[PDB]
Design an enzyme around this catalytic site. Sequence first.
Site, short mmCIF file in Angstrom:
data_model
loop_
_atom_site.label_atom_id
_atom_site.label_comp_id
_atom_site.label_asym_id
_atom_site.label_seq_id
_atom_site.Cartn_x
_atom_site.Cartn_y
_atom_site.Cartn_z
CB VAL A 18 -0.87 -1.25 3.51
CG1 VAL A 18 -0.42 0.31 3.55
CG2 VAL A 18 -0.05 -2.01 2.45
CE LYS A 33 3.25 -0.76 0.63
NZ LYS A 33 2.49 -1.22 -0.56
CG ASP A 118 1.94 -5.03 -10.07
OD1 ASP A 118 1.30 -5.16 -11.04
OD2 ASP A 118 1.91 -5.47 -8.89
CG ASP A 136 3.78 -0.51 -3.56
OD1 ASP A 136 3.78 0.13 -2.70
OD2 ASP A 136 2.79 -1.62 -3.43
O1 LIG Z 1 -10.74 3.76 1.54
C1 LIG Z 1 -9.89 4.27 2.34
O2 LIG Z 1 -10.24 4.85 3.55
C2 LIG Z 1 -8.33 4.26 1.90
C3 LIG Z 1 -7.46 4.85 2.93
C4 LIG Z 1 -6.01 4.69 2.61
C5 LIG Z 1 -5.71 4.15 1.39
C6 LIG Z 1 -4.13 3.82 0.86
O3 LIG Z 1 -3.78 2.96 0.39
N1 LIG Z 1 -3.33 4.66 1.56
C7 LIG Z 1 -2.02 4.96 1.41
C8 LIG Z 1 -1.19 4.01 1.20
C9 LIG Z 1 0.09 4.58 0.99
C10 LIG Z 1 1.43 4.04 0.71
C11 LIG Z 1 1.57 2.98 -0.17
C12 LIG Z 1 1.66 2.28 1.41
N2 LIG Z 1 -0.33 5.93 1.40
N3 LIG Z 1 -1.32 5.89 1.84
C13 LIG Z 1 -6.82 3.62 0.55
C14 LIG Z 1 -8.08 3.54 0.85
#
Ligand SMILES: O=C(O)c1ccc(C(=O)Nc2cc(C3CC3)[nH]n2)cc1
EC number: 2.7.11.22
Length: 286
Positions: A18, A33, A118, A136
Site C-alpha cells: 500500500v 494498493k 477480515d 478492504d
Molecule cells: O501512520 C501513518 O502515517 C499512516 C498513514 C496512512 C495510513 C493508511 O493506511 N491510509 C490509508 C489506507 C487507505 C486505503 C485502504 C488502502 N486509505 N488510506 C495508515 C497510517
Amino acid sequence: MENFQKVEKIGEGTYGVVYKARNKLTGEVVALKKIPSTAIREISLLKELNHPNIVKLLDVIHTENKLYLVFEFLHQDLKKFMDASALTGIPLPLIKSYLFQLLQGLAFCHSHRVLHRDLKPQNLLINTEGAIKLADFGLARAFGRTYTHEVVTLWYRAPEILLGCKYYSTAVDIWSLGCIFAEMVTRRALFPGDSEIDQLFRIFRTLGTPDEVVWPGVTSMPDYKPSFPKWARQDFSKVVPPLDEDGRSLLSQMLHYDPNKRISAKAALAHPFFQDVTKPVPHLRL
Ligand SMILES: O=C(O)c1ccc(C(=O)Nc2cc(C3CC3)[nH]n2)cc1
C-alpha cells in the site's frame, strides 16, 4: 500507473503493498494498493458500494497482469491510534462514536449482502474530523500469510470460521467488531490467539466451551471435536471493566456463539448504549 507519483510506502496488506500516491491529472492524494476475471467483476461491484463510513474505492486499474486499487487516503489507522492512546485510553464518548459509525458502515454493506470477513484495527481508518471508516470491504470474497510472509491475524475471527463453517454470514463482522470494541475499552486484545486452536481455546476460556444448549448444531461442525476441554463462562464484568451495563449488554450480544442469535448491525444501532452518542474530535498529531 504513469498517472501516479508514489509518495511513500504506507503498509503491507494481506494482498500486497500500500502506497500513498499523487494523481497527476486531478492533483488528488490517494492510497494505492498493488494486488482472474471473476475478481475484476466483483471488485468493480465494490466501486458502487459507497457510504461515509466505507473508505472510497476510486478506481480499479488492471494492467500487465497486475491489479491496482485506488482508494481515498486517510491519515491514520485505528491500530496506531490505540497504541498511541495506550497510557491514557481512548475516551468512552470517542469509543462509542467509533463503534456507532462502524455499525452504520456494517449495516449498509450487510444490507447489500456484502461482508468484510477480515475486520481488524489495521483496516479501520480515522480522520481529524472524528470519522472512522472501514477499509478492504469485499476484498476477501474476491481474493481469498501475506505476500511478505507476515502472519494474517486470527484475533478477530468468528468461532464459526474457526470451526470450519465455509458458508458463514454477516454475523462474522459483528463478532470482529465486538472484539475491537472490547480492545478499545480495555487497551488489550480480547483473544490474542497465535494458532487456530489457541484462538478457539482463548474464546472458550472466556465465553465457555460452546455446546448444543447455547449453539444448536455446534457439535456437528467440521472442526468441532468432542475432546475439546469444557471451560465455564466468565462474567463480562470481569472481561471488560469499566464498561457500563449498556456497553456490556451490547458486547455480550455481539459475542453470542450462535451466529443466528448474534445481534445484527441494524439492531445494534438501536441499542440503549447509543442513547447518548456524540461525535467528538480525536487528538491527532500527523
Ligand atoms: O501512520 C501513518 O502515517 C499512516 C498513514 C496512512 C495510513 C493508511 O493506511 N491510509 C490509508 C489506507 C487507505 C486505503 C485502504 C488502502 N486509505 N488510506 C495508515 C497510517
